[PDB]
Swiss-Prot record, chain D:
Its EC number is 7.1.1.2. GO terms for cellular component: mitochondrial inner membrane; respiratory chain complex I. It comes from Ovis aries. The chain crosses the membrane at residues 1-21, 25-45, 47-67, 82-102, 143-163. GO terms for molecular function: NADH dehydrogenase (ubiquinone) activity. It catalyses: a ubiquinone + NADH + 5 H(+)(in) = a ubiquinol + NAD(+) + 4 H(+)(out). Core subunit of respiratory chain NADH dehydrogenase (Complex I) which is composed of 45 different subunits. It is a multi-pass membrane protein. This is NADH-ubiquinone oxidoreductase chain 6. Pfam families: Oxidored_q3 (PF00499). One of its GO terms (biological process) is mitochondrial electron transport, NADH to ubiquinone.
Curated annotation (Swiss-Prot), chain E:
One of its GO terms (molecular function) is NADH dehydrogenase (ubiquinone) activity. It catalyses: a ubiquinone + NADH + 5 H(+)(in) = a ubiquinol + NAD(+) + 4 H(+)(out). The chain crosses the membrane at residues 1-21, 29-49, 61-81. The keyword Transport applies. GO terms for cellular component: mitochondrial inner membrane; respiratory chain complex I. It holds the Pfam family Oxidored_q2. It comes from Ovis aries (Sheep). The gene is MT-ND4L. PANTHER family: NADH-UBIQUINONE OXIDOREDUCTASE CHAIN 4L (PTHR11434:SF0), NADH-UBIQUINONE OXIDOREDUCTASE SUBUNIT ND4L (PTHR11434). Core subunit of the mitochondrial membrane respiratory chain NADH dehydrogenase (Complex I) which catalyzes electron transfer from NADH through the respiratory chain, using ubiquinone as an electron acceptor. Part of the enzyme membrane arm which is embedded in the lipid bilayer and involved in proton translocation. This is NADH-ubiquinone oxidoreductase chain 4L. InterPro entries: NADH_UbQ_OxRdtase_chain4L/K, NUOK/Mnh_C1-like. Its EC number is 7.1.1.2. GO terms for biological process: ATP synthesis coupled electron transport. Keywords: Electron transport, Membrane, Mitochondrion, Mitochondrion inner membrane, NAD, Respiratory chain, Translocase, Transmembrane, Transmembrane helix, Transport, Ubiquinone.
Swiss-Prot record, chain F:
This is NADH-ubiquinone oxidoreductase chain 3. Its EC number is 7.1.1.2. Core subunit of respiratory chain NADH dehydrogenase (Complex I) which is composed of 45 different subunits. Interacts with TMEM186. Interacts with TMEM242. InterPro entries: NADH_UbQ/plastoQ_OxRdtase_su3, NDAH_ubi_oxred_su3_sf. It catalyses: a ubiquinone + NADH + 5 H(+)(in) = a ubiquinol + NAD(+) + 4 H(+)(out). The keyword Nucleotidyltransferase does not apply. Its main location: mitochondrion. The lineage of its organism: Eukaryota, Metazoa, Chordata, Craniata, Vertebrata.
From Swiss-Prot, chain H:
The keyword Cytoplasm does not apply. Keywords: Electron transport, Membrane, Mitochondrion, Mitochondrion inner membrane, NAD, Respiratory chain, Translocase, Transmembrane, Transmembrane helix, Transport, Ubiquinone. It catalyses: a ubiquinone + NADH + 5 H(+)(in) = a ubiquinol + NAD(+) + 4 H(+)(out). The lineage of its organism: Eukaryota, Metazoa, Chordata, Craniata, Vertebrata. This is NADH-ubiquinone oxidoreductase chain 2. The gene is MT-ND2. PANTHER family: NADH-UBIQUINONE OXIDOREDUCTASE CHAIN 2. Core subunit of respiratory chain NADH dehydrogenase (Complex I) which is composed of 45 different subunits. Interacts with TMEM242.
């Protein structure tokens, strides 16, 4: 069959977000609140195209914008975030309820230095709309032409001609 | 069991008697092996050697049936100079029936086997000539 | 690797369609080390 | 040789079957079935079926084979060539399949079998914050209403049938 | 197909050949039947979990339970045989030849 | 790999202890005993009650297997259907128990 | 053969299109035969229980005849419906595919030649 | 057995067969088959005889092997198709496994060995329930999978069943074994026409069910289990002998009786497909079924075997058995030929 | 006979479990959802004969997704040729296939 | 009725207690007003990703941001 179209290694190169899982989980809510538009555009592109190779540039935007998140943490709120992600990182299940005072201090510093509001319950899990310029793929499954169905039955039901026509039976 | 009949039928009638005789002997030996397997399964022998003896007896009887039938049919089709004729297979079937009578050590079984096996072999040749089907594909 | 084998096209898909198919684990870690294969395919199940 | 672990386990599985396909004695056949059940539970454990593996340990071994051995203890009163013969025969054919599929990597008996490890056909994704098989079983009450009804009626009818037919009157 | 499919099918085949050749007892044949059911269980759950068929994961448990219920019934029949001839030998179940 | 290591360690400690218990005083020198229980000559008679409670355990164990995934199933969205099916399963279990009770099934092993 | 025809309206004894057909007459010979079968069954019922065959149980014989006639009338209606369905499908398939059913040139006997085999 | 428990068990048998008939999932087919087996086991153990226990054990072992082969076929089709819809199978091996599983369930030769055994060891009502009701669900499953049925295998099973049933019924003296071998021959007839026209399979199934019901009802009404009591029946009640003579005449395919209706129709669907040797061979073999039916009619109604002195006492008591639908089934099984086109309601 | 009680009565008893692309708990997709979906939307309502003779391409794709015969056959060919060239000494593994890649994230 | 109930409370208290508990379990969900709270607690759990919808141009009810006033609220679960 066909040859798989694959992007070159230069198309896959981007500056990574080299942080651990607890670092991301500490600032997950503010990352969702602030970096919402490129994330939602990338996820809509992924769910509509059904192909990673067609979404790569959108993915790059995520790896840009998230980085522009963390730098703003590093410039202004480095130390409370350091304490908060360390407290998150200690516990085995990375529970949020074990680090309430550090979370309060980090949120207070962020609000009074950057004006970011932490989302409430169910706010991040909402379904939102995205205005984008790329067109809707008319054939994402690459489906070919369906077979033509059989002709249907039409017309009134006339009685059987000369009955059953089974051997000597007249009807 | 389909490749044995194919290798028997792809030999043209009255051309090489050895290959036809070998193919018919193989078909008869397969039939005798099946019969002996069912006999030793359904009726258990009193000893292992008795079972091997019964299996060998059935296999040799049916192989002799096939070899004699194929040899006689090919020789008669060679000497009578007509390949497409059920009389040759009738002669081969009666020769097989006489072989059955010689194997079972009796005369009445030999005569009945001659008559019915000659009729059956003539019917088989007639069906091969006219394209009769026993396992007919559903076309209607 | 396959510059010598005749009748071989490099990157020939096994599917008649051009739609993207999620790569099977052997397609990804086919030519890697044994420990990477073990960590990738049995790391979660064998983790306590 | 670690990457063939499931395959290695599978060998013991079919080996355990020759433990009781030869039928040496109901106690030894039950022991072979116990070993085969533990090996099969390990096999399904290596595929992610933890609940189904513990179903095998809890219900097959601890539930049903216990009753089988318990009824065995009421028969086959305590105190061969054929058992050892078919055990040796089955082991020889089993190692013949092992050697052939480890040699030419592609065999066939009825279906075409591949000689690579079991790890190739695995999935590269992640299931998220749930186990897919766990919610598939958990959908027995939300989706499988008809299955629950027929299974419960079958078990009730089985209780009635069992206590009816052993009355003897 | 995979290697474990061959091994599970071979296990089913040898348990089937074990069932079809009775030696002396009936409990051994019942154990062979439960071995066949176990191999069916393993094959079905391997196929189901390989392909991420989510709902079908409810199935093999039923495949256990029903067949396990059948096993109980079989045991009762054996006990009835053991109540007549005192043993579970298969060579006493020939009263219907005539 | 940790569970397999723990299982192998427990198994090898068990067989080391069994071998030590079964072979350490075997190397001592003692005197042997003759080859010779209230029922030595009598055969074992069959009892229907033990087999009956065995099969009753098996059937209740199968219905326990059916009833088991309720902790996972309680997190569903069809809560009315889940509650109805769970109550129906336990009700059929109780119905089987009561029918075994009424027909003198639990007699002399009550 | 007709398994795909009655696949969109399943388990229908007599569909709506069956009402477009003339119902069987009450004086149908088949209905009279089914009523005669019911009367014979009533006579056998009288006979096997050691009763006067032509005398005992007039109400039972009447119920036998009535039930047989009822069931037979409905079965006959279904039978004519399904034969009409067969004819309709046959004619529709002939009309839809003209190339598979060519009209044959119907020659007279002055052009055709038939071999003469004398009997003597 | 309690009447309530017997009623519940009979509705469980009916529910299992209905579950096999109406389901679109293979697992539910398997579930219904196990329901049917588990619920029909105690009916064979109604009298608590050693023969009944051995018959139930043989039936259990055969049905267990058949159900396990059916599950293997279902699992193979699952692997090679990824779906459970009851339709054509997508592997020849699964089709072969399912076909031999349903052949073991129906009693087709060479899996027939349990049918003359088991039917001998169980009462007449349970034997009737077996030989009529247990053959509905496997025939439905065979009906649904005919695009994947191998023609060679099914025709081999059909001719083996017909020949073995005739040659087996040629020997027996017991009535139940005769009905078992007759059943084997009739299912050979029904499966021989399945791949050509399954409406004829339905018609032959219905006619066979009516005839077997009539014969077993007559045997229950006269309380006869061997041929000699059936011979004795002429003194007690002659009308019963006339009825069994007419029903045995109809069971052999003798025109103008209704038993000529199925097989002739079967020939009409096999000469259309240019298969001439097989229907002629099957009719020639069914002449043996006609032979042992003729032997039974010779023993019962066409002559008068001697009776005993105590039979006079039986002249003083009328029968009180609930002969349910006996006249209707006697009429329907014998005078149904002039309504032959009614089979078009089964198309 | 197949008495379609479910479609006549409008009830659903086992149609949710018949196929693999059906509605699932938490919308969990199977590994061959798209292939089976395409095969089903081909073969809908055209009959079994036209289904088996008209879109054999979609059924072959679905079977290839299900069992992966050709994928592991290609993997066997690649690994066998790699082992042969390793034995012949004309090939070496790159550092990124040996365990010193310092991978992506 | 009251004599029978006192009689079974005298002879078999275990069965009386079991039947009372079973009856309470079978009639109490239909009367407690907190079952709907369980239903929308189980509904509000985000197991999957809330995949966004493409803005055709007229969707006033759906929000454009997670912190927008549109969409469902969760103050009832916060308070209860």
């Amino acid at each position: 069959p066909g040859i798989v179209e694959l992007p070159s290694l230069e198309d896959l190169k981007v500056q990574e977000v080299k942080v651990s899982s607890s670092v991301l989980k500490a600032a997950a809510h503010h990352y969702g609140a602030q970096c919402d538009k490129p994330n939602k555009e990338f996820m809509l592109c992924r769910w509509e195209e059904k192909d990673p190779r067609r979404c790569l540039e959108e993915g790059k935007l995520v790896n840009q914008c998230a980085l522009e998140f963390f730098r703003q943490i590093k410039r202004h709120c480095a130390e409370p975030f350091t304490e908060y992600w360390t407290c998150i990182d200690y516990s085995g299940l990375q529970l949020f309820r074990r680090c309430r005072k550090e979370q309060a201090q980090f949120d207070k510093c962020v609000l009074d230095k950057l004006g970011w509001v932490r989302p409430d319950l169910g706010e991040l899990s909402k379904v939102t709309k995205v205005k984008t310029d790329r067109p809707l793929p008319e054939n994402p499954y690459h489906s070919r032409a369906r077979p033509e169905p059989n002709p249907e039955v039409e017309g009134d039901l006339k009685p059987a001609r000369h009955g059953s026509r089974l051997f000597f039976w007249t009807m | 069991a389909k490749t044995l009949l194919h290798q028997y039928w792809d030999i043209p009638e009255g051309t090489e008697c050895h290959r036809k005789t070998y193919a018919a002997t193989s078909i008869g030996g397969a039939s005798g092996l099946v019969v002996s397997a069912y006999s030793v399964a359904l009726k258990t022998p009193t000893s292992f050697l008795e079972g091997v003896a019964r299996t060998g007896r059935y296999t040799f009887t049916a192989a002799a049936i096939g070899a004699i039938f194929g040899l006689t049919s090919c020789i008669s089709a060679q000497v009578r100079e007509k390949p497409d004729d059920p009389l040759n297979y009738l002669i081969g079937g009666c020769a097989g029936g006489l072989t059955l009578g010689a194997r079972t050590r009796s005369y009445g079984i030999g005569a009945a086997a001659c008559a019915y096996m000659g009729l059956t072999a003539a019917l088989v040749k007639m069906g091969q000539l006219e394209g009769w089907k026993v396992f007919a594909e559903p076309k209607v | 690797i396959m510059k010598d084998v005749p009748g071989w096209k490099v990157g020939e898909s096994v599917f008649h369609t051009t739609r993207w198919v999620t790569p099977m684990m052997g397609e990804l870690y086919g030519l890697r080390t044994g420990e990477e294969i073990l960590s990738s395919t049995y790391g979660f199940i064998w983790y306590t | 040789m670690m990457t063939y672990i499931v395959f290695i386990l599978s060998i013991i599985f079919v080996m355990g079957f020759v433990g009781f396909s030869s039928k040496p004695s109901p106690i030894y056949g039950g022991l072979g079935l116990i070993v085969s059940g533990g090996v099969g539970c390990g096999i399904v454990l290596n595929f992610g079926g933890s609940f189904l593996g513990l179903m095998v340990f809890l219900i097959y071994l601890g539930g049903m084979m216990v009753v089988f051995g318990y009824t065995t203890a009421m028969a086959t009163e305590q105190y061969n060539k054929v058992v050892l013969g078919t055990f040796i025969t089955g082991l020889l054919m089993e190692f013949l399949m092992v050697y052939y599929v480890l040699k030419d990597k592609e065999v066939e008996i009825v279906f075409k079998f591949n000689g690579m490890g079991d790890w190739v056909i695995y999935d590269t994704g992640d299931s998220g914050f749930f186990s897919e098989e766990a919610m598939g079983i958990a959908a027995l009450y939300s989706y499988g209403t008809w299955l629950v009804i027929v299974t419960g009626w079958s078990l009730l009818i089985g209780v009635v049938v069992i206590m009816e037919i052993t009355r003897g009157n | 197909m995979s290697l474990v499919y061959m091994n599970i099918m071979m296990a089913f085949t040898v348990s089937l050949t074990g069932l079809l050749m009775y030696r002396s007892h009936l409990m051994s044949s019942l154990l062979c039947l439960e071995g066949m059911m176990l191999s069916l269980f393993i094959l079905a759950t391997l196929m189901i979990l390989n392909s991420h068929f989510t709902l079908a994961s409810m199935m093999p448990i039923i495949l256990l339970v029903f067949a396990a219920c059948e096993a109980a019934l079989g045991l009762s029949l054996l006990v009835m045989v053991s109540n007549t001839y005192g043993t579970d030998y298969v060579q006493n179940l020939n009263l219907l030849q005539c | 790999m940790n569970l397999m290591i723990t299982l192998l360690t427990n198994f090898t400690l068990a067989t080391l202890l069994v071998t030590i218990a079964f072979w350490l005083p075997q190397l001592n020198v003692y005197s042997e005993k003759t080859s010779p229980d209230p029922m030595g000559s009598a055969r074992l008679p069959f009892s229907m009650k033990f087999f009956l409670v065995a099969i009753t355990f098996l059937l209740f164990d199968l219905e326990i297997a059916l009833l088991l995934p309720l902790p996972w199933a309680s997190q569903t969205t069809n809560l009315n259907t889940m509650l109805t099916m769970a109550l129906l399963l336990i009700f059929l279990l109780a119905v089987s128990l009561a029918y075994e009770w009424t027909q003198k099934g639990l007699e002399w092993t009550e | 053969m007709m398994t795909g025809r009655q696949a969109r309206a399943p388990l229908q004894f007599l569909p709506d299109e069956a009402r477009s057909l003339p119902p069987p007459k009450l004086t149908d010979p088949r209905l009279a035969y089914i009523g005669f079968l019911g009367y014979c069954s009533g006579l056998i019922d009288n006979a096997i229980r050691r009763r006067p065959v032509l005398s005992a149980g007039l109400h039972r014989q009447f119920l036998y005849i009535t039930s047989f006639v009822f069931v037979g009338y409905y079965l006959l209606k279904r039978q004519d419906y399904m034969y009409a369905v067969r004819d309709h499908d046959m004619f529709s398939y002939i009309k839809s595919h003209p190339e598979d059913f060519p009209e044959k040139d119907k020659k007279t006997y002055r052009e055709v030649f038939e071999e003469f085999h004398p009997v003597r | 057995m309690n009447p309530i428990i017997l009623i519940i068990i009979l509705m469980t048998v009916m529910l299992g067969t209905i579950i096999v008939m109406i389901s679109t999932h293979w697992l539910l087919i398997w579930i219904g088959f196990e329901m049917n087996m588990l619920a029909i086991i105690p009916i064979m153990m109604k009298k608590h005889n050693p023969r009944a226990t051995e018959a139930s054990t043989k039936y259990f072992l055969t049905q267990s092997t058949a159900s396990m082969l059916l599950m293997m076929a279902i699992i193979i089709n699952l692997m090679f198709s990824g779906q459970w819809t009851v339709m054509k199978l997508f592997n020849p091996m699964a089709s072969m496994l399912m076909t031999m599983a349903l052949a073991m369930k129906l009693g087709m030769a060479p899996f027939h060995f349990w049918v003359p055994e088991v039917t001998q060891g169980i009462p007449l009502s349970s034997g009737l329930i077996l030989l009529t009701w247990q053959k509905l669900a496997p025939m439905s499953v065979l009906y649904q999978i005919l695009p994947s049925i191998n023609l060679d295998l099914i025709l081999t099973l059909s001719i083996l069943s017909i020949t073995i049933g005739g040659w087996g019924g040629l020997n027996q003296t017991q009535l139940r074994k005769i009905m078992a071998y007759s059943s084997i021959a009739h299912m050979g007839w029904m499966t021989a026409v399945l791949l050509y026209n399954p409406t004829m399979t339905l018609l032959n199934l219905i006619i066979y069910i009516i005839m077997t019901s009539t014969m077993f009802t007559l045997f229950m009404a006269n309380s006869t289990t061997t041929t000699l009591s059936l011979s004795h029946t002429w003194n007690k009640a002659p009308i019963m002998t006339i009825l069994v003579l007419i029903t045995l005449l109809s069971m052999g395919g003798l025109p103008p009786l209704s038993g000529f209706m199925p097989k002739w129709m079967i020939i009409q669907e096999m000469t259309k497909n240019d298969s001439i040797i097989l229907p002629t061979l099957m009719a020639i073999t069914a002449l043996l079924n006609l032979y042992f039916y003729m032997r039974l009619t010779y023993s019962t109604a066409l002559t008068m075997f001697p009776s005993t002195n105590n039979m006079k006492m039986k002249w003083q008591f009328p029968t009180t058995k609930r002969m349910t639908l006996l006249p209707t089934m006697t009429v329907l099984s014998t005078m149904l030929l002039p309504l032959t086109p009614i089979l078009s309601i089964l198309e | 006979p197949f008495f379609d009680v479910q479609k006549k009565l409008g009830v659903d008893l086992d149609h949710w479990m018949t196929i693999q692309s059906a509605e699932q708990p938490h919308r969990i997709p199977a590994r061959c959802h798209a292939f089976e979906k395409e095969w089903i939307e081909c073969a809908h309502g055209i009959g079994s004969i036209r289904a088996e003779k008209e879109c054999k391409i979609e059924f072959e794709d679905f079977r290839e997704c299900l069992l992966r015969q050709k994928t592991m056959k290609r993997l066997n060919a690649i690994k066998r040729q790699r082992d042969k060239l390793i034995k012949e000494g004309k090939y070496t593994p790159p550092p990124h296939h040996s365990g010193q890649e310092d991978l992506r994230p | 009725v009251a004599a029978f109930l006192k009689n079974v409370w005298a002879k078999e208290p275990v069965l009386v207690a079991s039947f009372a508990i079973a009856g309470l379990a079978v009639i109490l969900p239909t009367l407690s007003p907190y079952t709907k709270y369980s239903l929308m607690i189980n509904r509000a759990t985000p197991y999957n990703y809330p995949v966004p919808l493409r803005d055709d141009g007229n969707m006033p009810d759906v929000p454009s941001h997670p912190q927008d006033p549109q969409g469902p609220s969760l103050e009832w679960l916060k308070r209860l």
